[PDB]
Amino acid sequence: GSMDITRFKEDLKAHLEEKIIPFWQSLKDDEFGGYYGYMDFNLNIDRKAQKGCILNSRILWFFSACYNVLKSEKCKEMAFHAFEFLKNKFWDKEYEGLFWSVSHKGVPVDVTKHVYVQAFGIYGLSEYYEASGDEEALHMAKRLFEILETKCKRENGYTEQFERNWQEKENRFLSENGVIASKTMNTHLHVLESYTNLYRLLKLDDVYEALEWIVRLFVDKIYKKGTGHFKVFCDDNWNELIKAVSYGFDIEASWLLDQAAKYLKDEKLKEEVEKLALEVAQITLKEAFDGQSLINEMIEDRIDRSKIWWVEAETVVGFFNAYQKTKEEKYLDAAIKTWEFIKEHLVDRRKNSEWLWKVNEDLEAVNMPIVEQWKCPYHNGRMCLEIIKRV
Ligand SMILES: OC[C@H]1O[C@@H](O)[C@@H](O)[C@@H](O)[C@@H]1O
Ligand SMILES: OC[C@H]1O[C@@H](O)[C@@H](O)[C@@H](O)[C@@H]1O
C-alpha cells in the first residue's frame, strides 16, 4: 500500500457514497416496483420505460454489495426493493428462470430465456443472499444454476437463447454485419462471474466443477493464444465471425479470471489462468492505454477511440489487480490515471446525474442515456467496491 493508494480508495469510496449510491436510489419506482428503466441525456426519467431484467439484477447486485461492503441499511432496503421486483415480475413461476424484459408495470414484454440474463440473476441473487440471508434468493440462485447446467450447457459452452419453456433457439446477438453469433464472450464471461460468486458463498462441489469447467473454456476456446485478446462474437464452434478486439472485455476478463483462479483446486490450471490474466493485462496496457484512458475496440483494422463508461471502470479494476499481482508501478499509474480521466470527462457535472455513457475521441460528450437497459450501477459501482475491498 501507499499514500497514493490510500487516497485513491478514499476518493472512490467518497464517490460511491456521495454520487453513485444516491443517484441510483433516486431511480426507485415506488409506484410499480423495481427501478425506472430509462433516463435520457437531459436527465429526464421515462417512468413508463420498459424494464430490463439485466438492469434490475445489476441494481440488485449493486445495492446488495454496497450493504455487504459498507453496511448501509438504506442500501439493504434498496436491494430488497430490486429483489421483490425480481421475484414478483421477472421470475417465471410456471417454467422457472428470468424473463428478458417486462413493462414498467411488470407485464412480461419478452419472455424468452437468455443465459446472459440468468447469469446476472445468479450474480445478484447470490449477493443479495449474503446481504439478507433470504433462503428464497438462495433457492432461486441454485435453481438458475441447475437449469443452466442441465438445460443450457453443451459440449463447447452454453446455448445462449431459449424459448420461455427452455426449448433452444438461435441467438439474439448479431455481428455488425447481422450474422447471428451463436457463442458470445460476454454471455460466457458473466456465467463465469456469477458462478464465482455462487461458489464463494456456497462452496458446493457441483458449483465448483462448473466453475472449473467455464474457466477451462476460457483458457482453451475463448482466449486467442498468443494475442492477449479474447474472441468476441463467434459461430457455434468458437470461430470468430469477425476479427474484433474488445479492450473492455479483455481487461474485465483479466481480473475476473484471476478472481476465479483463487478458488481453483487444480494447481496447473490455476497457474495457467494466473499467467493468462497477466498476459492480457500487459497487452491491454501496451495496445489500448493511451496515457490517459483505455480505447474501446478494434474491428478488423478500424479502431474506436471513444471512451466508454464501463470500459474505463473495468480498466481501473483490471490494472489495479495487475498491480497487486506484479507490484509493477506502471499498472498502478495507469489505474489511477484512468480514474482521473473518469473524474474529469465521464462523471457528469450536472446536478442529479451520474456517469456519462461515453465521450468521443476528442473528449466531447455524446447524447446517450444515463440509465438504460444496458447502463447500470454495476460496472462503475463495482469499480469503487473492488478498490475498497482490495485496499
Ligand atoms: O441538467 C439537465 C440539463 O442539462 C443540459 O446540459 C441540457 O442537456 C438540458 O436539456 C438538461 O435538461
Ligand atoms: O408487453 C406489455 C406491453 O404490451 C404492448 O403491446 C402494450 O400493450 C403495452 O402497453 C404493454 O406495456
Ligand SMILES: OC[C@H]1O[C@@H](O)[C@@H](O)[C@@H](O)[C@@H]1O
Ligand atoms: O450490450 C451489452 C453491453 O452492456 C454494457 O452494459 C456492458 O456490460 C458491456 O460489457 C456489454 O457489451
